Design a protein around this ligand. Structure first.
Ligand SMILES: CC(C)C1NC(Cn2cnc3ccc(Cl)cc3c2=O)=CS1
Length: 203
């Protein structure tokens, strides 16, 4: 039995990519979704017995776990089209610190440099859905994966503020944290090679 953790920042496009591949090699495969805020918090619980985690969160070294990079993915800062900062000026991009952020909360109550909120007016949520509800209602700005915001952005229900900070949206690394047990196993290298391909082509 193999247990695999994918945070909700990973497109579910991808979540198909591993399933075919991993099950070529392995017999039981459990897929588990967490908040990116909870990805690393979870694997560190010995009892949770996670073997692989696909997460955007970065941490320098973790016990009993090697890191590597499967690929990259875009994220956008989004707000209500009529949000004060809709004018999207480099002045407005410094002012994020001043307007209310809808940030992802974490059970541990603790956040990495990566996912820690930026503004002091913060309101926490469990998933990117509650995030965008509140953002669609002009209650704040928030930073969400492409696949969540592509729908609403074409629909005009939502606006991007992040395009002068990083044109193209914000590339984020997708990390593979894997139990050291796996490094030698031809099983893993197979999955890794396949995994990288689909996130590439999914770009
Ligand atoms: C404050 C922004 C200017 C930036 N914050 C980040 C970190 N960050 C935060 N949440 C995310 C949620 C989802 C995804 Cl896919 C990525 C991120 C992310 O990178 C980068 S610039």
């Amino acid at each position: 039995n193999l247990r695999v953790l994918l945070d909700t920042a990973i497109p579910p496009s991808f979540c198909d990519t591993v399933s075919s591949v991993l099950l070529d090699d392995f017999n039981m495969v459990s897929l588990i979704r967490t908040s990116p805020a909870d990805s690393l918090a979870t694997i560190k619980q010995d009892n949770a017995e996670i073997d692989i985690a696909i997460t955007i969160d970065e941490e320098l070294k973790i016990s009993r776990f090697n890191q590597c990079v499967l690929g990259y993915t875009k994220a956008f800062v989004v707000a209500h089209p009529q949000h004060p900062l809709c004018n999207a000026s480099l002045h407005s991009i410094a002012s994020l610190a001043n307007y209310r952020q809808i940030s992802l909360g974490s059970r541990s109550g603790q956040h990495s440099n990566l996912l820690r909120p930026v503004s002091d007016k913060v309101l926490f949520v469990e998933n990117f859905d509650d995030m965008l509800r509140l953002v669609e209602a002009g209650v704040g700005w928030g930073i969400a994966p492409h696949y969540f915001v592509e729908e609403r952005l074409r629909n005009g229900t939502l606006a991007v503020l992040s395009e002068l900070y990083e044109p193209g949206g914000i590339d984020t690394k997708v990390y593979c944290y894997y139990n050291t047990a796996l490094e030698s196993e031809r099983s893993f290298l197979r999955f890794l090679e396949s995994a990288r391909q689909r996130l590439r082509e999914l770009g």
